Design a protein around this motif. Structure first.
Motif, PDB file in Angstrom:
ATOM      1  N   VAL A 223     -20.126  55.340   8.081  1.00  0.00           N
ATOM      2  CA  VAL A 223     -21.118  56.395   8.125  1.00  0.00           C
ATOM      3  C   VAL A 223     -22.344  55.884   7.355  1.00  0.00           C
ATOM      4  N   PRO A 224     -23.566  56.083   7.894  1.00  0.00           N
ATOM      5  CA  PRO A 224     -24.775  55.615   7.197  1.00  0.00           C
ATOM      6  C   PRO A 224     -24.790  55.990   5.718  1.00  0.00           C
ATOM      7  N   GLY A 225     -25.011  55.005   4.855  1.00  0.00           N
ATOM      8  CA  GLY A 225     -25.024  55.240   3.424  1.00  0.00           C
ATOM      9  C   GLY A 225     -23.664  55.219   2.745  1.00  0.00           C
ATOM     10  N   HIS A 226     -22.583  55.126   3.518  1.00  0.00           N
ATOM     11  CA  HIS A 226     -21.242  55.142   2.934  1.00  0.00           C
ATOM     12  C   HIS A 226     -20.517  53.797   3.140  1.00  0.00           C
ATOM     13  N   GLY A 227     -19.244  53.747   2.761  1.00  0.00           N
ATOM     14  CA  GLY A 227     -18.461  52.522   2.825  1.00  0.00           C
ATOM     15  C   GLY A 227     -17.752  52.283   4.142  1.00  0.00           C
TER      16      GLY A 227
END
Ligand SMILES: *[C@@H]1O[C@H](CO)[C@@H](O)[C@H](O)[C@H]1NC(C)=O
Ligand SMILES: *[C@@H]1O[C@H](CO)[C@@H](O)[C@H](O)[C@H]1NC(C)=O
Ligand SMILES: *[C@@H]1O[C@H](CO)[C@@H](O)[C@H](O)[C@H]1NC(C)=O
Ligand SMILES: *[C@@H]1O[C@H](CO)[C@@H](O)[C@H](O)[C@H]1NC(C)=O
Ligand SMILES: *[C@@H]1O[C@H](CO)[C@@H](O)[C@H](O)[C@H]1NC(C)=O
Ligand SMILES: *[C@@H]1O[C@H](CO)[C@@H](O)[C@H](O)[C@H]1NC(C)=O
Ligand SMILES: *[C@@H]1O[C@H](CO)[C@@H](O)[C@H](O)[C@H]1NC(C)=O
Ligand SMILES: *[C@@H]1O[C@H](CO)[C@@H](O)[C@H](O)[C@H]1NC(C)=O
Ligand SMILES: *[C@@H]1O[C@H](CO)[C@@H](O)[C@H](O)[C@H]1NC(C)=O
Ligand SMILES: *[C@@H]1O[C@H](CO)[C@@H](O)[C@H](O)[C@H]1NC(C)=O
Ligand SMILES: *[C@@H]1O[C@H](CO)[C@@H](O)[C@H](O)[C@H]1NC(C)=O
Lengths: 344, 224, 211
Positions: free
Chosen positions: B40-44
């Protein structure tokens, strides 16, 4: 003194020159006769490391079964990529025979005799042999058939149980018969497999209890395969040259572990398929429609292949699904106690 | 060399499906599992599952059971693996990667280049472009800032250039932000000499290919 | 589940320095079960280290994997610009949350600018007020919107650039969005900026409808 080594093995068998059955025909020209008087020497005070998951004997057996099948099976059509080969497809005689694997001069086979040996690690009761026991090259999925049994307790075999990509082989210590029939009794491809539910559910509960010991007493749940070709999602095997596909949903029934109706006979619905995916790798083959009359085969279930669901969820339970990663794992299930070493 | 080439970025409505392909090359396809991973954008990174090309057997992550309807398949002749996601929800907006373990190390992933899947109820819309006008109080012999506000478009991306690329020094084009409307907005700004404001023309060129919208917007001091 | 803990979450180092990244596991693992990956912003991950300590082909020798038991380390000597990235450890199907390696430089105060909404936008019924913070370091900055001295919260959105590869600074935009009606209710619009490079907060303002 000896050391771990790989070498070209040869095979031995009781194949007969007058037999039309294709395993016999292959073994007649590819193997020597079985040793009339086999010798086994128990090595006193010797500890030896084994690793069934890295054992070149398995790769060599694999190449033999590939060559055997390549020379034996006669499908009406062979399909590979864009290459299509039509040929005669007469019904053949097909029934695996035990094949022994033997070392040449300068080498010997070490054999682990520890009764609860799991396939890897040290073995404290080691003997040396010239040849393995007779191993039938049974090509099947989900259930291991007509194999040998674990001598004491049910054994869980895996290169690493934490690793969900590693095949789990469950080695049974008591056989359960599976009775498959295409009745002369009208769908000519319709067949069924009968299993004694009392015998099977007792064994399956024993398997779940052994899995519990290896997975921190977590609850063990079975589920059907999540996907794959039919050879994967169903119990796939051959009977009298015919390719069978049986639905094993009823064979892994969580309700019958740990109440009413689970003692009766388990009937699995099966189909004989003319079009199959080739286990040798990439390829499709089409065979002629089934032979007339009653088609029947009784096999021993002696092992189960499992895959565990990966990923992380708050875990009361671990989920397992029938089916293993590789046909070579079938050979592993029998070759696990053997290792080739070179004599110095 | 081992290479995994995925299909292109996608945009879907909630409830729809998407099929991502992963074309392998440089090795013997059937001897290695293909894995899928989402980010997910911005996540791991989060592993979704693997497929075994020998038979097509799969292993789906328990972490996504009930949360993501997925099907992994492959075509051995085409040496391509497929990820099919059905009944998409906005929370499925992510980059999806396929991967293959380094030889001998099934969990040391070699990565495909990734496929962005946007799931949104928003409909395709080109941006409105507004001037961020240089302040009339810009220090006489100093530096001025100006820019364009690129507002209310969908989906990403927009590109912004200044003076058709003839101005790049001091340009900052910000990452788009998703508004509660479901439309994106971003600004592009540039710092320029205050002395240039009366003589040099500044035009922001906005291109939003999904709506075939192009805008050339002149940004000048606001008249009093 | 194997729980992976990466530390620190963010490293700020000068180019030329050495980065030491840790991956700690809840249970002892086998070395072969661990990998390191690098991810530059907007890019796919790239395998760096396989099997705990083996450098992947093409990976520069300044990247070195070590460790055993429950503690694994990725060491990056002589940091170059392209090395400032996020690094993930992987064990089996599990990933760490990542360590961001960021470029250290001298503190730089932001240059601050405020932009009123355009008349064209106002015509359509909406007012976007934009505050720009340009070329600052470190990343931490507070932007506070004030409308007739009333502190605004919840009607703005911020966007920050990736760290500039050329000068290692950041820039940030904050956009306050109001209806035309709400915008016309008030006179003074201000953004107040707090940053380590400023001895006291800087405010830029305008009065609505004023040149
Ligand atoms: C080793 O195993 C064999 C079975 O092949 C058994 O007969 C023998 O007693 C065992 N030896 C010891 C010392 O346990
Ligand atoms: C097999 O036994 C060895 C040696 O005791 C042990 O290290 C390994 O974990 C065991 N494997 C399984 C699957 O029980
Ligand atoms: C089946 O199992 C029984 C008992 O385990 C054994 O006696 C018999 O030889 C087995 N048959 C085959 C074909 O393996
Ligand atoms: C098979 O092993 C289980 C434990 O793994 C044991 O309880 C059972 O008695 C064994 N059965 C036989 C026939 O040895
Ligand atoms: C197997 O199934 C056939 C047909 O249903 C039946 O006649 C036979 O008794 C069963 N058992 C064996 C051992 O063949
Ligand atoms: C099924 O197996 C059990 C032994 O576990 C035996 O008592 C029972 O008679 C078998 N059922 C039939 C129909 O033979
Ligand atoms: C097996 O049978 C069950 C129940 O009839 C069915 O839901 C499932 O789809 C079947 N599996 C296959 C592979 O046909
Ligand atoms: C599982 O076993 C129960 C007996 O308690 C039976 O009613 C049910 O139909 C079985 N389910 C399947 C899928 O075989
Ligand atoms: C197992 O052995 C029996 C008897 O030897 C045979 O009829 C049957 O076909 C074999 N099963 C398989 C799957 O080869
Ligand atoms: C499986 O891996 C774990 C660490 O992830 C290790 O503790 C265990 O010994 C391994 N199992 C075997 C049989 O080597
Ligand atoms: C960051 O860079 C400046 C200037 O080169 C230096 O003075 C400072 O010590 C550095 N900080 C760190 C944490 O390396």
């Amino acid at each position: 003194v000896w050391k771990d080594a790989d070498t070209t093995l040869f095979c031995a068998s009781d194949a007969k020159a007058h037999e039309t059955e294709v395993h016999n025909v292959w073994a007649t020209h590819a193997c020597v006769p079985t040793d009339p008087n086999p010798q086994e020497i128990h090595l006193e005070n010797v500890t030896e490391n084994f690793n069934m998951w890295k054992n070149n004997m398995v790769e060599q057996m694999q190449e033999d079964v590939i060559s055997l099948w390549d020379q034996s099976l006669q499908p009406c059509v062979k399909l590979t990529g864009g290459s299509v080969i039509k040929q005669a497809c007469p019904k053949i005689s097909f029934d695996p025979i035990p094949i022994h694997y033997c070392t040449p001069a300068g080498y010997v086979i070490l054999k682990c005799n520890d009764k609860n040996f799991n396939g890897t690690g040290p073995c404290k009761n080691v003997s040396s042999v010239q040849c393995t026991h007779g191993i039938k090259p049974v090509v099947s999925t989900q259930l291991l058939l007509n194999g040998s049994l674990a001598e004491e307790e049910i054994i869980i075999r895996s290169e690493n149980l934490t690793n969900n990509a590693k095949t789990i082989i469950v080695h049974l210590n008591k056989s359960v018969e599976i009775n498959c029939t295409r009745p002369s009794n009208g769908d000519i491809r319709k067949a069924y497999c009968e299993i004694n539910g009392t015998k099977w559910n007792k064994v399956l509960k024993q398997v779940t209890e052994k899995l519990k010991e290896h997975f921190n007493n977590k609850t063990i749940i079975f589920q059907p395969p999540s996907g794959g070709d039919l050879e994967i999602t169903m119990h796939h095997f051959n009977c009298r040259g015919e390719f069978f596909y049986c639905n094993t949903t009823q064979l892994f029934n969580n309700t019958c572990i740990g109440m009413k109706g689970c003692n009766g006979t388990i009937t699995l619905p099966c189909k004989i398929k003319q079009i199959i995916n080739m286990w040798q790798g990439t390829g499709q083959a089409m065979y002629a429609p089934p032979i007339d009359g009653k088609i029947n085969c009784v096999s021993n279930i002696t092992g189960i292949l499992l895959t565990r669901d990966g990923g992380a969820n708050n875990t009361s339970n671990e989920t397992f699904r029938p089916g293993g990663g590789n046909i070579k794992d079938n050979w592993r299930s029998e070759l696990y106690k053997y290792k080739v070493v070179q004599i110095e | 060399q081992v290479r995994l080439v995925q299909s292109g970025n996608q945009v879907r409505k909630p409830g729809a499906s998407v099929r991502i392909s992963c074309e392998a090359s440089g090795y013997k396809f059937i001897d290695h599992f293909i894995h899928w991973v989402r980010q997910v954008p911005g996540h791991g990174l989060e592993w979704l599952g693997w497929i075994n090309p020998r038979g097509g057997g799969v292993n789906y992550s328990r972490s996504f059971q009930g949360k993501l309807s997925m099907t992994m398949t492959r075509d051995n002749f085409e040496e391509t693996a497929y990820l099919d996601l059905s009944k998409l929800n906005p929370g499925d907006t992510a980059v999806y990667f396929c991967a293959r373990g380094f030889a001998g190390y099934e969990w040391s992933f070699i990565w495909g280049q990734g496929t962005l899947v946007i799931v949104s109820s928003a409909s395709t819309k080109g941006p409105s472009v507004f001037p961020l006008a240089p302040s009339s109080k810009s220090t006489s012999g100093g530096t001025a800032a100006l820019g364009c506000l690129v507002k209310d478009y969908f989906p990403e991306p927009v590109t912004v250039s200044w003076n058709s690329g003839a101005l790049t020094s001091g340009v900052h084009t910000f990452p788009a932000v998703l508004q509660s409307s479901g439309l994106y907005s971003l600004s592009s700004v540039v710092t320029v000499p205050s002395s240039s404001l009366g003589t040099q023309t500044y035009i922001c060129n906005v291109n939003h290919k999904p709506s075939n919208t192009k805008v050339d917007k002149k940004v000048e001091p606001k008249s009093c | 589940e194997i729980v992976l803990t990466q530390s620190p979450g963010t490293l700020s180092l000068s180019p030329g320095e050495t980065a030491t990244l840790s991956c700690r596991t809840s249970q002892g693992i086998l070395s072969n079960q661990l990998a390191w990956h690098q991810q530059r912003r907007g890019q796919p991950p790239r395998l760096l280290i396989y099997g705990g300590s083996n450098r992947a082909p093409g990976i520069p020798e300044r990247f070195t994997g070590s460790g055993s038991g429950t503690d694994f380390v990725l060491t990056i000597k002589r940091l170059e610009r392209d090395d400032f990235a996020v690094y993930y450890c992987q064990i089996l199907e599990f990933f760490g949350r990542g360590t961001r390696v960021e470029m250290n430089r001298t503190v730089a105060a932001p240059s601050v600018f405020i932009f009123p909404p355009s008349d064209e936008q106002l015509k359509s019924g909406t007012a976007s007020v934009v505050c720009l913070l340009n070329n600052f370091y470190p990343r931490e900055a507070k932007v506070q919107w004030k409308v007739d001295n009333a502190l605004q919260s919840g009607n703005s959105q911020e966007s920050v650039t990736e760290q500039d590869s050329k000068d290692s600074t950041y820039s940030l935009s904050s956009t306050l969005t109001l209806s035309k009606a709400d915008y016309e209710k008030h006179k003074v619009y201000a953004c107040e900026v707090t940053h380590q490079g400023l001895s006291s907060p800087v405010t830029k303002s305008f009065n609505r409808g004023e040149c």
